[PDB]
From a paper:
Consider, for example, the Ras proteins, which are prototypical members of a superfamily of membrane-associated small G-proteins that control an extraordinary range of cellular processes. Ras proteins are capable of producing a diversity of signaling outputs by binding to effector proteins, most importantly to the Raf family of kinases, which activate the MAP kinase pathway. Ras proteins cycle between an active GTP-bound state that transduces signals by binding to effector proteins, and an inactive GDP-bound state that cannot bind to effectors. The switch between the GDP- and GTP-bound states is accompanied by correlated conformational changes distributed throughout the structure of Ras. Two segments of Ras, referred to as Switch I and Switch II, undergo substantial rearrangements when GTP is replaced by GDP, as illustrated schematically in Figure 1 (for a comprehensive review, see Vetter and Wittinghofer, 2001).
Leu 120 is in the guanine-binding loop, with the sidechain in van der Waals contact with the edge of the nucleotide base. Mutations at the base of Switch I (H27G), in helix α5 (Y157A), and in distal regions of the guanine binding loops (L120A), increase the rate of intrinsic nucleotide release. We found that the transition between the R and T states can be triggered by one of the hotspot mutations identified in our study, L120A. We determined the structure of wild-type Ras•GTP and the L120A variant at room temperature, both crystallized with the same crystallographic lattice, and found that wild-type Ras•GTP is in the R state, whereas the L120A mutant is in the T state (there is evidence in the electron density for a minor population of the R state, with an occupancy of 20% or less). The two conformational states have been denoted ‘R’ (assumed to be competent for GTP hydrolysis, although this has not been established definitively) and ‘T’ (assumed to be inactive in terms of GTP hydrolysis). Crystal structure of the L120A mutant shows a rotation of Tyr 71, whereby the sidechain is exposed. Additionally, the interface between helix α3 and Switch II undergoes a conformational change. Helix α3 and the C-terminal helix of Switch II shift downwards in the transition from the R state to the T state, leading to a rotation of Tyr 71 from a buried to an exposed conformation. S. rosetta Ras adopts the T state, similar to L120A, where Tyr 71 is rotated outwards and exposed.
Numbering used by the authors: 1 to 166
Write the structure that this text describes.
């Protein structure tokens, strides 16, 4: 069966782990335990193909920025996550997209932009602003909530579909 190596990146606290755990384990993690580097595996059927997803959940706390480079090198596609109630996390995306281009040494890496926490009441990043950033990179934008599970499968499965176009 086909294996896809996916990496989830973005600032601290935006919900990378909650998104991943919703996908893999079908529950919402309410507490905040910062991640170092965790890996998950799951067999799924996507568009009639039996796939193995190997997901690397990375640290957003900038103390681990150096260790991240070597883990990210093996990734085939990246989920770049910000939170729609955290303007700085959106402004930080550009940096993660530069780190990816450095570790992969390529300008054409499969990637999806994810605006998480779309259940939150205090939105400061409008959908149009994120669509414009995604358009500049040539990638899809999807909004998610790890809390309600909205968009979670869509975000990960769209990333697989992007890997398949490359
Ligand atoms: N309301 C809401 N809260 C969320 C959502 N996703 C994550 N959270 C909450 O935000 C906090 C941080 O989530 P977490 O997934 O640990 O963030 P992270 O990006 O993995 N942090 P780190 O980079 O430090 O590992 C948790 O309290 C979690 O419940 C969401 O979609 N909606
Ligand atoms: Ca819970
Ligand atoms: Ca985490
Ligand atoms: Mg504004």
């Amino acid at each position: 069966m086909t294996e896809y190596k996916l990496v989830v990146v973005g600032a601290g606290g935006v919900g990378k782990s909650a998104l991943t755990i919703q996908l893999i384990q079908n529950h919402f993690v309410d507490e905040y335990d910062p991640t170092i580097e965790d890996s998950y595996r799951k067999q799924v059927v996507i568009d009639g193909e039996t796939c193995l997803l190997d997901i690397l959940d990375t640290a957003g706390q900038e103390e681990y920025s150096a260790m991240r480079d070597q883990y990210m090198r093996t990734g085939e596609g990246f989920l770049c996550v910000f939170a729609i109630n955290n303007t700085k996390s959106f402004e930080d995306i550009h940096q993660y997209r530069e780190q990816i281009k450095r570790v992969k040494d390529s300008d054409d890496v499969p990637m999806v932009l994810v605006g998480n926490k779309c259940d939150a009441a205090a939105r400061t990043v409008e959908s149009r602003q994120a669509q414009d950033l995604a358009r500049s990179y040539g990638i899809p934008y999807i909004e998610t909530s790890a809390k309600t599970r909205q968009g979670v499968e869509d975000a990960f499965y769209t990333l697989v579909r992007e890997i398949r176009q490359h």
